[PDB]
Design a protein around this ligand. Structure first.
Ligand SMILES: *[B]([O])([O])C1=[C]C2=C([C]=[C][C]=[C]2)S1
Length: 261
């Protein structure tokens, strides 16, 4: 059975909608499945927010050390790093780390509020040639992931193309590009997702995302031991609002598309 058939068989038994975009930078060949369809990004959009601040930091050498006050009121839901700093301060770099590596929502909203709001993250994405990405809301409401809702969505292919540009490509200056990579490699939240479908020795940098309707996402950059890097986006969402998240589906989708490398 072909990869396309394995992914269609995986989607069918899953009770949800599967979106996959793999980019093999060796020859820029692509494995695509619903790759032009819109999915709620959920926390995977946190990569774009941080990246935007890294871009700013190219022309402002004092930015990433700029201190930001964390008060109790700033605490939305789920603030694993930010809660440890209430009545204190975090630098933008520490916020960019917390947002990516622990999926901290306080950190995400601080980055958004610094940039000037969700529209500004959208604007940044556009400047990278990404005409699909759109961030509309702050945390946690950006995770409603309602079917048919265009807010806070993008497509697997577009997000794979942008992630490639951000981590391996021309989007950021070298120093900034290297920091984003370092941040993604040190993710702590992606063990049961794409990483679970790959060889253990492979190096991986990823940002997971989950929301309502069982929306379960993960976007990764993969460095094999004897091959060029791979960029993989795996998106998955389900019909019913209180569906269970399904990281195992992302691990399964990762294993299917990499069987050959
Ligand atoms: B993300 O997509 O990984 C997350 C979204 C929310 C979290 C906690 C509380 C509300 C939304 S983590």
């Amino acid at each position: 059975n072909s990869v396309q058939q394995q992914l269609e068989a995986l989607e069918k038994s899953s009770g949800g909608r599967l979106g996959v975009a793999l980019i093999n930078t060796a020859d820029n060949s692509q494995i695509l499945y619903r790759a032009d369809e819109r999915f709620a990004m959920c926390s995977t959009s946190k990569v774009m927010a941080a990246a935007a601040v890294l871009k700013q930091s190219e022309s402002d050498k004092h930015l990433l050390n700029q201190r930001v006050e964390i008060k109790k009121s700033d605490l939305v839901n789920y603030n694993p790093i930010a809660e440890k700093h209430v009545n204190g301060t975090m630098t933008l770099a520490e916020l960019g780390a917390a947002a990516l590596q622990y999926s901290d929502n306080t950190a995400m909203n601080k980055l958004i509020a610094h940039l000037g709001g969700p529209d500004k993250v959208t604007a940044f994405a556009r400047s990278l040639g990404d005409e699909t990405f759109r961030l509309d809301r702050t945390e946690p409401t950006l995770n409603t992931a309602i079917p048919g809702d265009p807010r806070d969505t993008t497509t697997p292919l577009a997000m794979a193309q942008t992630l490639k540009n951000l981590t391996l490509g021309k989007a950021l200056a070298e120093t900034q590009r290297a920091q984003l990579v370092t941040w993604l490699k040190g993710n702590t939240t992606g063990s049961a997702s794409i990483r679970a479908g790959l060889p253990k020795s492979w190096v991986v940098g990823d940002k997971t995302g989950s929301g309502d309707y069982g929306t379960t996402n993960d976007i990764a950059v993969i460095w094999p031991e004897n091959h060029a890097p791979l960029v993989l986006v795996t998106y998955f969402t389900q019909p019913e609002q209180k569906a269970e998240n399904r990281n195992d589906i992302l691990a399964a989708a990762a294993k299917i598309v990499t069987h050959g490398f």
